[PDB]
Amino acid sequence: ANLWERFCNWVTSTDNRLYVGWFGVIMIPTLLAATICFVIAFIAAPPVDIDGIREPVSGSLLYGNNIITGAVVPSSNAIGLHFYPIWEAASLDEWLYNGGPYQLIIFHFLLGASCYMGRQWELSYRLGMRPWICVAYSAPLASAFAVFLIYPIGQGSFSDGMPLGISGTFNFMIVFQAEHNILMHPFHQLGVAGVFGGALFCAMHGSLVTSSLIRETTETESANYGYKFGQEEETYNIVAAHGYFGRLIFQYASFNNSRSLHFFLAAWPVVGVWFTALGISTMAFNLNGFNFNHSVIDAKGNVINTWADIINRANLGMEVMHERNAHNFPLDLA
Partner 1 sequence: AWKGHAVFRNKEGEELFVRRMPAFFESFPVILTDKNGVVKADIPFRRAESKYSFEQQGVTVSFYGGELNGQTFTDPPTVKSYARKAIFGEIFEFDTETLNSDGIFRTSPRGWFTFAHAVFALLFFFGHIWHGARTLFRDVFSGIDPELSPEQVEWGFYQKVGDVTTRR
Partner 2 sequence: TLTYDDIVGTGLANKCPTLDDTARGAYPIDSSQTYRIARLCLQPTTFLVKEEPKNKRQEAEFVPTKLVTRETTSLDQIQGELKVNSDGSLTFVEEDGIDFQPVTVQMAGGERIPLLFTVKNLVASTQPNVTSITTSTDFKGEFNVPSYRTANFLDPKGRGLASGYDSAIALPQAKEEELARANVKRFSLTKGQISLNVAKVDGRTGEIAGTFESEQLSDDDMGAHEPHEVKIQGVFYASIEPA
Partner 3 sequence: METLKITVYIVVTFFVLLFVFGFLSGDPARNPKRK
Ligand X SMILES: CCCCCCCCCCCCO[C@@H]1O[C@H](CO)[C@@H](O[C@H]2O[C@H](CO)[C@@H](O)[C@H](O)[C@H]2O)[C@H](O)[C@H]1O
Ligand Y SMILES: CC(C)=CCC/C(C)=C/CC/C(C)=C/CC/C(C)=C/CC/C(C)=C/CC/C(C)=C/CC/C(C)=C/CC/C(C)=C/CC/C(C)=C/CC1=CC(=O)C(C)=C(C)C1=O
Ligand Z SMILES: CCCCCCCCCCCCCCCC(=O)OC[C@H](COP(=O)(O)OC[C@@H](O)CO)OC(=O)CCCCCCCCCCCCCCC
242 among the known binding-site residues?
Answer: no
| Closer residue to partner 2 in complex, CB, 206/317 | 317
Of 3-11, 31-39, 168-176, 216-224, the segment contacting ligand X by CB under 6 A is 3-11
277-280 — which CB contacts under 8 Å span 24+ positions? 277/139, 277/142, 277/143, 277/145, 277/146, 278/142, 278/146, 278/187, 279/146, 279/182, 279/185, 279/187, 279/188, 279/190, 279/191, 280/143, 280/146, 280/147, 280/150, 280/151, 280/182
251 among the known binding-site residues?
Answer: no
DSSP string, 49-104: -TTSSS-PBP-STTTT--TTT-EEPPPPTTTTT----GGGSS-HHHHHHTTHHHHH
List contacts with partner 3 (CB under 8 A).
4-5, 8, 11-12, 14, 22-23, 25-26, 29, 85-90, 125-128
Which residue is nearest to ligand Y, using beta carbons? 205
| Closer residue to ligand Z in complex, CB, 79/277 | 277
51 among the known binding-site residues?
Answer: no
| Closer residue to ligand DGD in complex, CB, 143/159 | 143
CA separation for the pair 197, 141 (Å, rounded): 19
Judged by beta carbon distances under 5 to 8 A according to partner kind, the member of ligand CLA, Cl ion, ligand X, none in contact with residue 328 is Cl ion
At 164, which helix (H) or strand (E)?
strand 164-165
Give the C-alpha distances (Å, rounded to integers) separating 26 from 3, 39, 49, 205: 20, 20, 31, 36
Binding pattern for the stretch 3-42 against ligand Z, x by CB under 6 A and - elsewhere: ---xx-xx--x----x------------------------
327 among the known binding-site residues?
Answer: no
Question: Do the Cβ atoms of 287 and 270 come closer than 8 Å?
Answer: no
| Closer residue to ligand OEX in complex, CB, 28/53 | 53
Half-sphere CA count of 181, side-chain side, radius 13 A: 18
Question: Could you tell me the end-to-end alpha-carbon distance of the chain, in angstroms, rounded to an integer?
Answer: 58
Question: Do the Cβ atoms of 113 and 32 come closer than 8 Å?
Answer: no
- With binding defined as CB under 6 A, does residue 4 bind ligand X? yes
Judged by beta carbon distances under 5 to 8 A according to partner kind, the member of partner 3, partner 2, ligand Z, none in contact with residue 128 is partner 3
- With binding defined as CB under 8 A, does residue 218 bind partner 1? yes
180 among the known binding-site residues?
Answer: no
CA separation for the pair 318, 315 (Å, rounded): 5
Could you say which of 213, 265, 271, 308 contacts partner 1 (CB under 8 A)?
A: 213
**Which DSSP letter does residue 224 get?**
G
Could you say which of 48, 104, 146, 283 contacts ligand CLA (CB under 6 A)?
A: 104
Binding pattern for the stretch 45-84 against ligand CLA, x by CB under 6 A and - elsewhere: ---------------------------------------x
Judged by beta carbon distances under 5 to 8 A according to partner kind, the member of partner 3, ligand Y, ligand X, none in contact with residue 307 is none
Contact positions vs ligand CLA (CB under 6 A): 26, 29-30, 33, 84-86, 103-104, 107-108, 111, 114-115, 117-118, 121, 173, 195-196
